[PDB]
Amino acid sequence: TNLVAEPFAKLEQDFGGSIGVYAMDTGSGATVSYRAEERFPLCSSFKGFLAAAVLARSQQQAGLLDTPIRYGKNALVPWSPISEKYLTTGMTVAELSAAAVQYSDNAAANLLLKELGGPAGLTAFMRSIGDTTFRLDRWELELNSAIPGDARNTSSPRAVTESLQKLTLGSALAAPQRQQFVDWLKGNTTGNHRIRAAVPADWAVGDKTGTCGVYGTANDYAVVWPTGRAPIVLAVYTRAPNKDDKHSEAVIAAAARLALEGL
Ligand SMILES: *C(=O)N1C[C@H](NOS(=O)(=O)O)CC[C@H]1C(N)=O
Q: Which residues cross the membrane?
């Protein structure tokens, strides 16, 4: 049997769907794993990796992050609260990246995808850092459909955590770019009820959320710095069988608590 898994199984049964969890202590190598290699929809959570892919490009393209993008109304899509405010002035690539990560701005994400050569360009970046699981093939809003058994626009909790560790703590980005990615994640505004609700208040957190909403689908991944300790990387993804099944931020927080307790 798996006694470590039993509280996760009870949580997902009460939720009425499936929860996927992977957590690793980067100091000790201790892990907590529940459905860690199953696929779950990415939803908005792809935007963290998008920002990292833009930072990687910015190492070789002088002034890329400083470049003003002067987009029109045709670039705007629902839930673009930051992009709606700069139609006459524009935003720099850095500002679009911050908006995509910290407000989950959809127009900003589509403008940055265009920079990379679309969803195929982001998937190619993820392959370049050793992630064979990540798949993205749609723009906002089509990537959010989250239909059960559709492997498009999915990854696994384990592959998300492994890629997050490479980009935030490892050598996949040069140090100035690694630091910018960490700072964007630390400044996220959309995750206060998810992994952040599970961590002691004094611990530093960087995270990116995803909320397809349909089929009980939502997620969060984070780098967590416990006071005086090596960082923890973790991912919590959910899905459910019925289209009208509601996501739960409380279930994500609860799964994150069990992960931290299990390390
Ligand atoms: C991301 O999944 N989305 C963007 C936005 N919410 O941001 S969140 O992911 O940080 O919660 C609206 C929901 C969703 C979308 N349909 O694009």
A: none
Q: Is 110 in the pocket of ligand 1 (CB under 6 A)?
A: no
- Residue 127 makes CB contacts below 8 A (sequence gap 6+) with 134
**Is the CB of residue 207 less than 8 Å from the CB of residue 188?**
yes
> Could you tell me which residues come within 8 angstroms of residue 74 by beta carbon, excluding any fewer than 6 positions away?
none
| DSSP string across 23-43 | EEETTT--EEEESTTS-EE-G
* Elucidation method: X-ray
If one counts the domains in the chain, the total is 1
In terms of residue numbers, what domain contains 58?
4-262
CA 251 to chain CA centroid, nearest Å = 17
If one counts every other C-beta atom within 10 angstroms of the C-beta of residue 7, the result is 15
Number of neighbours of residue 89 by Cβ within 10 angstroms: 8
Whether ligand 1 lies within 6 angstroms of the CB of 191 is answered as no
CA distances from 150 to 20, 49, 66, 153 (A): 16, 21, 38, 8
Taking the C-alpha atoms of residue 43 and residue 108, their distance in angstroms, rounded to an integer, is 15
- For residues 224 and 19, what is the distance between their CA atoms, to the nearest angstrom? 20
- DSSP letters, 152-217, are TTEE-HHHHHHHHHHHHTSSSS-HHHHHHHHHHHHT-SS-TTTHHHHS-TTSEEEEEEE---GGG-
Cβ distance 263 to 30 under 8 Å? yes
44 is catalytic: yes
CATH number, domain of 120, equals 3.40.710.10
Please answer whether residues 21 and 255 qualify as being in contact, where contact means their C-beta atoms are separated by less than 8 angstroms.
yes
* Cα dihedral 68, 69, 73, 74 in deg (nearest 10): 170
